[PDB]
Amino acid sequence: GDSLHEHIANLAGSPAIKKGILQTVKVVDELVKVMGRHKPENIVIEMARENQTTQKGQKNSRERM
DNA sequence: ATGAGACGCTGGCGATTAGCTAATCGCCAGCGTCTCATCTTTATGCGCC
User: Where does Mn(2+) 2 bind?
Assistant: First the structure.
């Protein structure tokens, strides 16, 4: 039992995220609901995870000694 | 076997008399700490269907 709301407010972390999530999810639901009430071909999203190099990633995480 | 019907300075002043939002800008915003624990999550480091 998780409604279209609630489940978002059942997530882990800070409430700063819950607002944004509720916004984007309701936007997506409306987007599919407008364009013929049928699911689109693809949905592309942007992720904050980028690929750093080995040298820099080991240089910043090099234990102090 | 006669005695009613016919009605004004106002407009254009002053001069009281009375009364009201709005546009511009500036100021200035309760805050101080610690303890205690609690969980996460991240950077790096190790494995083949």
Answer: 50
The nucleotide closest to A12 (CA, C1' atoms) = B40
CA of A15 to C1' of B40 (A): 15
Instruction: Classify residue A28 as left (phi > 0), alpha (psi -120 to 50) or beta.
Output: alpha
Q: What is the resolution of this structure in A?
A: 5.3
Of the candidates A9, A39, A34, A40, the residue with the CA atom closest to the CA atom of residue A22: A9
Task: Please name the residue whose C-alpha is nearest to the C1' of nucleotide B45.
Answer: A58
Cα–Cα dist A8/A46, whole Å: 20
- HSE (side-chain half, CA atoms, 13 Å) at A39: 3
Q: Where are the beta strands (DSSP E) in chain A?
A: none
Experimentally, the structure was elucidated by cryo-EM
